[model samples]
Target: VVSEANSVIVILDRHGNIQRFNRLSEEYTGLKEQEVIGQNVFTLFMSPAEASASRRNVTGFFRNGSSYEVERWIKTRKGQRLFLFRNKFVEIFLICSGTDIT
Candidate 1:
C-alpha cells in the first residue's frame, strides 16, 4: 500500500519486524525497501546506540500512546551519518515519520 508520506514513514510491529518501508523513506535513508522489509527496522538503519534510543523511545511511546518528535542521526548506506527530524505518527501503528532536516 502506498502511503501519503510528505516525509518518511516506516511501519514495524511491536517485535521490531519491519512491515512497510515507504518510497520516500528509501530516498531519505538510501536503504532499499527490499533490504529493510521483514527485518528489524532499528537494526537496519541505526547504529547499536542509536537503535537503543530508538527502541526505548518507541517503547515509551507505546506505553503512553503519544506522538513524538526528535532529531536523530542515522547511518546511510554509504556510511555517512545523516541527521533527521524524527517523529512517531502513533504508537498503535508504529509508523515513524521522519524529515531530513540536516
Candidate 2:
C-alpha cells in the first residue's frame, strides 16, 4: 500500500517552498505540515550542505531538464539531525526522501 511504502511525502512549489507535507513527513521530521509548508527549503529543515546542493540540483534540473539527486545531513524539527536523500523528479519537482539508515 502507499502508506507502507512511502515513509514520507512532500511537495514543493517551483521556488522550493513546501506545498504539501504528509503525516508521514511530520512523524519523521518532527515538524507539522502547516508549520513547514510555504517556507523556503534553504530557510527551513535542510542543513547548509544539503540546502545548497538542493538549490543547485533542483534548479539545474528545472532549467536544463536534467534529473539528479543529492544526499546529506538534514535536521528535524526537534533538532535531531540525520542523513537524507533528496531526489529531483521531472526536472522541477523535488522529493526529499530518506531516513536514519545508520
Candidate 3:
C-alpha cells in the first residue's frame, strides 16, 4: 500500500538508516534503497543544517514518542533541493510519509 502511494514513504531504524524507500522516494531522490539502506539518512542526503535539525527532531521524538510535521528542503542525489512536507514518527521504526512540494 505504501509503495503504491503517491507520496514519498520511508521506514528507518532508530539511528535513521533507511529500511524502505518507496518508488516515489526513488523518483524524487534518485537513490536506490539497496545502495542507501544502511546509510544514515541525514548525513547521507541532507545538508548540514538539515542534518542537525534532523538530529534534534529524532531526539525529541525519542524523548516523547510524539508525531510531528515539518516542511524543509531536502537534497536529492542529483544535488537539487526539493520542498518536503513530512509527517513523521517512531513506530519501532521511524515512519515518514509526505510529498514533494517543490
lDDT of each: 0.70, 0.65, 0.74
Instruction: List the lowest-lDDT window of 10 residues for candidate 3.
Output: 82-91
Candidate 3 per-residue lDDT over residues 1-102, each given as its tens digit: 434667778787778788888887788777788877878888877888888988688767766776778776678766656655454664667887867776
TM-score of every model versus the real structure? 0.73, 0.69, 0.81
User: On a 0 to 1 TM-score scale, where does candidate 3 land against the true structure?
Assistant: 0.81
Highest lDDT model number: 3
- Which segments of candidate 2 are over 4 A away from where they belong? 1-6, 77-80, 83-86, 90-92
| lDDT per residue (tens digit) for residues 1-102 in model 2 | 544544456666568888778786777667788898788866677767778876776666666654444455556755646555555563446666654543
* Model 2: lowest-lDDT 10 consecutive positions: 65-74
On residues 1-102, what C-alpha lDDT tens digit does candidate 1 reach at each position? 754666667787676777777787787677788888888877777889888987888677776766657776776655645555454554446776667665
Candidate 1 vs candidate 3, lDDT winner: 3
Candidate 3 Cα errors over 4 Å, as ranges = 1-4, 88-90
CA error at residue 102 for candidate 3, angstroms = 1.8
Q: Give me the runs in candidate 1 sitting further than 4 Å from their true place.
A: 1-6, 28-30, 81-92
